[model samples]
Target: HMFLGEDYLLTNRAAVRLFNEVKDLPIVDPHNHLDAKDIVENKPWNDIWEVEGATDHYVWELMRRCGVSEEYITGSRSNKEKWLALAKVFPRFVGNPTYEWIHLDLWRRFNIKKVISEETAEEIWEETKKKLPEMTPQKLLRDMKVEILCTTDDPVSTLEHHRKAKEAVEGVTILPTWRPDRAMNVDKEGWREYVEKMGERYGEDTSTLDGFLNALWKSHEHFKEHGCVASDHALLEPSVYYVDENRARAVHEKAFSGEKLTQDEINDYKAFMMVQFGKMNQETNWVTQLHIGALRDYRDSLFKTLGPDSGGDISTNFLRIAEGLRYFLNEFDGKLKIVLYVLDPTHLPTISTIARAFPNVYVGAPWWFNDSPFGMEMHLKYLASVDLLYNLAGMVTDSRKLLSFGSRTEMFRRVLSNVVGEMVEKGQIPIKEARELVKHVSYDGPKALFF
Candidate 1:
């Protein structure tokens, strides 16, 4: 058998049997970075690298580690050159999740059975070029059985693409997730410009805290009108330190006037925004997704050249996530449906335990650095041990590439089936109950929680 056979991750007999049962279930991809415009347009990509390697930080990170030049990775090199460069380094990706994901795409989506490497680059590229015409974003989503796709969008976004995709695309429900990170970035550059643009969108003066809140709420309502079911946030550290209304106003005025806020003031402002986000989500019944512990743009030189998410981000400390989430949940009386995601796997149990404490809180899918087969299996076991498996919110693609929705969802489902099958084989659970449990985590859990 080839490297990735039918039972690649399924080791136990029950796992192999159970995997067949749920492997073909429709994917409920509640969170991803796929562009709605891409789906709406449904244009064919130029080549395999354009669709597979470009915009995927996972692959880019590996290429960089293998000493592939920036020109081939993200620079002005030709697409064929980039594809050849990645293929040269592809063999180095052994045992990496990115390796499996790429192979899965090749075998499942493109039907190219040969392993990817410098030796097979030309053959795979030629075959891929022929197949690219039929691999439109919309077609891929349909072929992958993607039922729901919640794309991350800014608060000020018009959501024009989402609206168009909803009308044009048939099988998938493209919804927006309100991500107000830029608006809440008080210490970051361009905060004033961003807030002014946001205010203009709502025809309000964002010079004041109250006005900014109003504009944010208005955008939230706009998103809801277009089927937004969740609000997403990315934070360096989770710290919800509530400030009084007077301090909040003062900080807003200070930042609006282009004055640099002290660290304490910035913390206070973020804390207030966090609580406000909770209140707004609670009122609208929107799930609040907090993606914490990402230290983005660590390489300043590379950042200036390539900008953000160019494989420069890394996991940081998970400090204060538990404390902050507890405070945020309490402030909202535990009514807000919160999904907590930490890039660091060490905090998985911490987040899961917190989810067990609150009724609506849930530990999100293994994210970013931790979204691998090993990571998923470990997370599932930890959650099951703590009796929080039922509260698990399931997997998300968390990807930018359109075809990644297929590869990532497939990875999670296979790992989940293996985990549940292990439990059944160990007599920890009955097969009938395992089937139901696997179904819940694989599909029903996320559908009920996020959508």
Candidate 2:
């Protein structure tokens, strides 16, 4: 595919040899959705199928519900029906990076040689199943050379698991990320209920707006104690701009009263809280991530069943976000560390433009919908054109799967190397310089960006 670079997909002999040669390099996964509890207790999976099974139904059903065809779902049904269906769609996806990832997973993780197809589906499944139980989450982390793991967590989470994992593990570091998007959504349904729950968990009064702020402040402190230096927030189109204390208090009162506010009212309240959160981030010197431009949870039925992150989110036509982002960045330019994830690939030009204009703001890699090989390449090309990608943080796999850490980072390294190699081939850059630049993107860039 045009996305996999002109070079044929690198063979396992090459990729594995390269990995073995650089296996000792330290990894700094600044952002991810990995489960901290499993790492805390060092939990073991009963079987390969069992581990895959937990996420299988949700994955298949989600793809199905998201308008994926039956040939991509259950053409020849069995226990491993849907996964096989996805495998068939793999090769047809020439430009899609997901195919390469599946290739990488099979080759690097399990050493399966045959391409994922009807002929090799069962073979791959059985081969992988045999080794799944042997693969521990920690073992997978170790295999990826991950030295620092930061997981996305809700605001009210105790973070006990993260602390415990940090204590239990020797070389690697596990850190917590304060994600309070749900709690901060004063415009969404059940906003007050969420706030009250957050307040109660932190032992702060929830009856008034002050109490709400107090609870959030306290939670930030609690998260900080456990090594939380970043906060992640997801915002869709038409951002919540800003709010004054009086107006915020009024919204807080209405939220507490359980009154249904209009969309405008809700956004106003949300904007108010958003600025407050930025102020909080500035005050504490914590990196704040705003994942903007996602039209999330398009399938209401699946969303109801699977909640969020069940793959229901889709991209939207986003306006140039410079003005909207300026609302917050204008106040605390260098005072805050802001990492923005843009989901819509079409908006990369404007995203890059905005990133170059602002010193504190950097364009986050194409995440979610655009995290595939094609998407990653398109993203890097655009970013490299407008911004200094070497200075930009590189390769944070926004994924829940621990194995995906290797998939994303390694994929990025390959793409980075190939991009540099192509530039060298064209006489655009010297081979020595390209090699040095690729090294920074793969390893040094992330280390310097994250604490």
Candidate 3:
């Protein structure tokens, strides 16, 4: 069986037939890290490395693990040299989803057939060079049948690129997501500066708690005006300390004044802000997304040099996630539409069961470290077993690269088809029911959840 063939990952006849039913369904990417400017500009990529390697943390991590130099990974090497470096490490990615993603991208986008390795690197590079002129962010999205995509955006952002993209690109809806992490992270470095920037942008004094909430609400309103349907938060874990307004104000003032605060105080402030965010989302009918359990930038030396999201993150535990969600949902009386994404796999059942308790809460797609084939399958099975599949918010790209929308969606659809197909073949479910479930998970779920 050739990698990425029609029947790839579909071992059973039911799987292959099920995949063909919804293989070309429009992509509903509610969450991704794509820069709006890329689609707005719609410019051709420079070369293979620029499209494949640059800014992809997944590839950077693997290359580093395979003993490739930083110069080739993220440093000042030529794109060709970097491609060659990755070529040497490509075959090493046998079981890694990264390898499959690259091959699929190359095959679908450039029509390249050969495996990527040191031997075929030069030939693939030359072939990709010829096709680069035909590929642009807009073209890529259209080719992949991306109906709608939301880019992660900060509160202070103008969203000028989103506006430009909406007008420039036809048949694709490019929207913004409200991500106010900087404003909420009271303990992180540069918190005051970010607050000040927010204040200046919104023409409000964010020094006070009232003023800060007002600024956030204003930003939320602005986001809605620009077609934002969701808000996103990335937390080390999900926890709510439930502090009083006065106490939250004090913590805000202390953090703004550059005074040291205890962990408890920080937790209280974050919890207070989370509640406020929930209230805002409820008021505006916006979905609130929480991405949790990631202990970010652990490698201090690389973090200092390479910065955040450069593959320095690792999965960590948050025993309080269920507790925190229960608290948050209770405060809202289960009115807020909250989607939870956990980086730690141990919490899958925990989160899924929690989702079963609240009608408004959903277990988001397997995220970050858990976006691989095995992880996806396990996550699907776990949720289905818990009777949470119907409530599950389907897959989101959560990707920074444009090409990922294609590769990731393709992989997910194939994997999902296989999962459902096996059930049908084993007589656990009928083919008709499988068809409906596949459509629901593949497109209808996310479409209804986010939009």
Per-prediction RMSD in angstroms?
1.2, 4.0, 1.1
Q: What are the per-residue Cα lDDT tens digits for candidate 2 across 91-192?
A: 565455655665666667877656766687778778877787778778877777888988998888888888778877767889889888887677567676
Whole-model Cα lDDT per candidate?
0.86, 0.70, 0.88
lDDT of 3 at 302: 79
Clashes of 2: 1
The reply for model 1, stretches above 4 Å from the true place, is: none
What is the per-residue lDDT of model 1 for residues 377-415, given as tens digits with 9 covering 90 to 100? Answer: 898888889756766887889888877777888788888
lDDT of model 1, residue 66: 96
> What are the TM-scores, per candidate, against the unseen true structure?
0.98, 0.88, 0.98
- The segments of candidate 2 whose C-alpha lies over 4 angstroms from its true place after superposition are 1-24, 46-95, 238-242
Lowest-sum lDDT 10-residue window in model 1: 317-326
True-structure lDDT of candidate 3: 0.88
What would the TM-score be for candidate 1 when compared with the true structure? 0.98
Clashing residue pairs, backbone N/CA/C < 3 A, model 3: none
After superposition of all CA atoms, the RMSD between model 2 and the true structure is 4.0
